Amino acid sequence: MDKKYSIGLDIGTNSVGWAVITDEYKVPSKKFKVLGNTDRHSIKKNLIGALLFDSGETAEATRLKRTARRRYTRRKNRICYLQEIFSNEMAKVDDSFFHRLEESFLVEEDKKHERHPIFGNIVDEVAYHEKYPTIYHLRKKLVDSTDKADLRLIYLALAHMIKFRGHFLIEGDLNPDNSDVDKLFIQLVQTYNQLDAKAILSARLSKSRRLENLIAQLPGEKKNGLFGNLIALSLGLTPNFKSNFDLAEDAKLQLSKDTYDDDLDNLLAQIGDQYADLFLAAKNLSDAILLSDILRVNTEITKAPLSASMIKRYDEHHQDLTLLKALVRQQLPEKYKEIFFDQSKNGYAGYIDGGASQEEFYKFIKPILEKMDGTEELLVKLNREDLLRKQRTFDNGSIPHQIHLGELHAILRRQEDFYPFLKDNREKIEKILTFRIPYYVGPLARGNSRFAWMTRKSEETITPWNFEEVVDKGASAQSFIERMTNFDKNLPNEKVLPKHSLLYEYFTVYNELTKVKYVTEGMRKPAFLSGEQKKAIVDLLFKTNRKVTVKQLKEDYFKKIECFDSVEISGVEDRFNASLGTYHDLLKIIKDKDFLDNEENEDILEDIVLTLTLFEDREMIEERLKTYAHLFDDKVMKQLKRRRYTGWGRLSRKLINGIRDKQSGKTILDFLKSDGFANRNFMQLIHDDSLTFKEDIQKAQVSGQGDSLHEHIANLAGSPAIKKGILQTVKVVDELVKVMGRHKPENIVIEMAQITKHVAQILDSRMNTKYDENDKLIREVKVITLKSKLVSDFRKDFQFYKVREINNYHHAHDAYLNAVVGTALIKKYPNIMNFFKTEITLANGEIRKRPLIETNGETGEIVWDKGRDFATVRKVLSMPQVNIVKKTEVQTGGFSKESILPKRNSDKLIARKKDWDPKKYGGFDSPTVAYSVLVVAKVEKGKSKKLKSVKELLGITIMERSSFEKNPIDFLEAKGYKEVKKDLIIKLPKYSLFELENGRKRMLASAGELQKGNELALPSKYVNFLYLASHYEKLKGSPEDNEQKQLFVEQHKHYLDEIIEQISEFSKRVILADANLDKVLSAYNKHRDKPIREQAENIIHLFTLTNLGAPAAFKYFDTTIDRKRYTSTKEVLDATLIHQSITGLYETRIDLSQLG
RNA sequence: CGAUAAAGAUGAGACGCGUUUUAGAGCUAGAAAUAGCAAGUUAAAAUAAGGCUAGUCCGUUAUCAACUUGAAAAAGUGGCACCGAGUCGGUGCUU
DNA sequence: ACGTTTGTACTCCAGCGTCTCATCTTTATGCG
DNA sequence: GCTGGAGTACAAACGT
């Protein structure tokens, strides 16, 4: 039979609601066959339901932890590099110093050499920690020593600098001597003249505000160049020097960039060295502004100013510490034990030994400082956030690597005379500090990664010193862009040409001009310009004028070439749109119309623009054009190198001039140039009986021939969770087609709360798959897209109200009403929703009458009867059995919580490495269970060695999962299970459904906790009343309708008692939370004499006691009911396990009572 | 109709902090128990266990009823009406 | 008839800030 | 924040 039906969907980020209706808008009911060892053999089910699943996560967290893993690996490799550089000498001075460093984490019994990590004795360790209290004291000492020092001290200082090196944001060497901001500004004005500045520059005001403030209070007269260089200093960026200093072109000589030197040279040619002193002062002032807050110390007594500043911070911590100690011992003696001994408060002891930040300690110690006297400067430092500070602090992220490199340079230039190996390896260690893999090279994989693009020039290990001789950086950055840009849509095998290609612009000119038509003198035939005439017009106007030519210019060229027949032109605009811009720039730079005109040099120019579009670091551009420097002078070689092109086109070169029909041999560009008086455009050759259009379809089919369902949802443009929803929606559609005897649905209706267009296309592609004799796709299944507004409109107009707090039936009810509205309006119209209200209002206040049976105007149709349609959809909405399935999913993600908890005697701690005993070291805690397994075996119970046979539910950790799947039997025997039964092991993922007495259901949250599994089928009257009462002040309708709703909600005030009675009955049947229910009834009893709106707004809040899923806390009326957790899955082992299909219609029920 | 801007997705390269264990000798009184006093700012190592394909890679995204085949991918498996409704029941027909 | 284990109820806890660069869609806004 | 793990105190129920 035909068995006509339709399928409705509601795709969500967290759920997929589905419904099947017939031609009479009825849900069909069908009896299904179940499997398993249970006694039930057939179950009657209704063809409406929803599928719930966890939200799809983005890849960002995985990306960040992957990047962190790479960073830790690289830092460990730097430590190994420096431990191979110092290796031979360190074997002589103190062998196993590196080994004492590596075993520092272990407890003293687990150590192999000595507990003291540096010198191996107690006296020298104490002397080191007293002579150099922090690492910065040793850093300052080794920077300024002039004496020989122990090699361990040099290693510790330089290793601390390499391990914590700083940011690479400031490009260019930063001299630490420039520190006076006021002198920098006055020197800028003075050098300009020859050719509170400190407070204003170092103020925390914005760079825009800072420049504006200095410009407002500007003593310099006729000194706009001083103001521009001041912008280039404080802001770090000058404006266009064509107006700032009368340069030839717009020159933005912004500092802190590698292009600063090249733009400065361009300005020196463009201005004529009339701003060099300004640029020089700007650089000095930019430095002194940048290092101002970083190095808050005078810079005339040391070469390591960061060490001096941190020593000053340590010293002020000590001074204000002893003074605060004295003042609390002298004025508030009842608080010294709390501030300086208690590690649980936010005092000093919590700030150092506990877990208090600087903010928390400041907030705690401020009121103590206020009430006591003598605390003036301590308070002043606290507002300046400079009281009792530490060196390793949150604000150390602004220290540039130039400072650490300067200190490291100072030790390798102060200790190189005594230790000779430092002198030849100085640049090696400096490279180890400063080497940073570029963003266009990526992971240095040998081919064993799915994220790598790097190409190797050699086959050797990539050390930080052979990176430029082993990694082909050109091909690396080429592959970096070439994996990211999309392939050709027509030919999905090969890549895509740059947007600024000469071939593409020539194609656009010739395609527009081929679409353009001329007009003859007598016949006035459109046709087109001839191919020779086309090239002549291009060279006359489009190759002459950089901007597009006007129709007047085209007419002037037509009359200029030969005597015009008629300058009128058909199929053309007032001005053209295609421009020969890149050829014009090459004619303005290369300045010869020979290489840019000869077709033998076309591939050269295409590679030129490939380089300009591809690379943006300008050294890469430098080398790739240096390959081609033999055909041009050096000046244009360093001028065109500074040209950057942005953008990628949507067409490829094989589509444009690579595909040629075997009958003709002409390219698509050649066909556009000369079509034999046919004037066919690109879309003409792409959609005709020519051989070009056939090969495109054959390649679009042959290549990407798989194009799997998960692939095509995966390669879309949207959030991952909505892609999960779309994929589950498609699977639901397939199974719903299967359920009805594999007959196709007549319509499919879609609603999501461009991606809608795409999911419509997927469903249309899978359902509509039949072509006629003339190869025309017959639309057997009309996939319909619907906005969400219409559904809510009817929901409110026909009072088909939803409270989402009752149950998850509202999802499938949205799906059913979706497939009611959509297929009604596809019939009534083949206000638009005014065909619905029978008493439709008018501008005169008249309730214009409507027919009971609505119909289409043009032809007779049963679109909507205002009787027996209410009854059907009311029945389906009040229908108690609708199939909600929570998607059983194996958990993936982190093994446990990321917090490293301290040591305990508990066994729940997890070994953070292989041999780290957690009772000594501590470690991770609370692991994540991948899935639970039901194991029937016998355990060792009792002191008398008794094998008590037991059935238990054991949770498998994500970490344990691979070891369990390698050998389940051996894993169980290692766990403590003797003589297990291999064939009764059942894999139970999260949200596995179990059925118990009185229809009670529980979902498996884990091996030791369950979730509520039942749904309260509260009738339509109660949910309609609850929406009317809670939206009492937000009715948003006509005043008569609002008054009628108010009268209706006042007349049924007794419905609250019926609602709470339904809640109590359903909670007593399946929820089984006696104390929570008693507190609920006490709270409802206490709060009866309150208005109905608030009462129903909190009866809505009540319904999360009975909601599907995890137990949750809630508040009714100023009282919080804490969650009743089911923390024992012992009842589940005697229950009935239900396996369900994605729709849930097809079931497999296992009686676990019979297993064992 | 080019063009700009915002948001989102994906990928790469870098810092700063935090946590853990250990190292920085606590002293004095007291038989001890516990007090009085001193002091504190730093470093090493690890930062998903680990894996083989041994890379200055990979390891937390996406995918996932049961059943029968398939290496996997993937394919295959469950009769239809009608009257009723508290998580679906009943009746008839036919396999 | 002690003893040990499983059921309850209750409380607490959960890795986080920044910067540079690149490539795609998808919305949006004034032009006119 | 969610919601699952874990610790703690206290008693009921099952083992021997």
Residue numbers in the entry: 1 to 195, 207 to 764, 926 to 1002, 1041 to 1366
Question: What do the authors of the reporting publication say about this deposited model?
Answer:
The CRISPR-Cas9 system (Clustered Regularly Interspaced Short Palindromic Repeats-CRISPR associated) from Streptococcus pyogenes carries out RNA-guided DNA target recognition and cleavage and has been repurposed for precise genome manipulation. Programmed with a single-guide RNA (sgRNA), Cas9 specifically targets and cleaves double-stranded DNA sequences flanked by a protospacer-adjacent motif (PAM). Following DNA cleavage, Cas9 remains stably associated with the dsDNA, limiting product release, and results in single-turnover cleavage kinetics. Cas9 is a highly modular enzyme that undergoes large structural transitions during each stage of its reaction pathway, enabling conformational control of Cas9 activity.
Each subclass was manually inspected and sorted into five distinct conformational states. These states represent the progression of Cas9 through its reaction cycle and comprise the (I) pre-activation, (II) pre-cleavage, (III) checkpoint, (IV) product, and (V) dissociated states. Following R-loop completion, the DNA adopts a kinked conformation and induces large conformational changes in the nuclease domains. The pre-cleavage state represents this intermediate where we observe that the DNA is bent towards the central channel, diffuse density for both HNH and RuvC nuclease domains indicates rearrangement towards active conformations, and the DNA remains intact. When the R-loop is fully formed, the PAM-distal DNA duplex adopts a kinked conformation and initiates nuclease lobe reorganization.
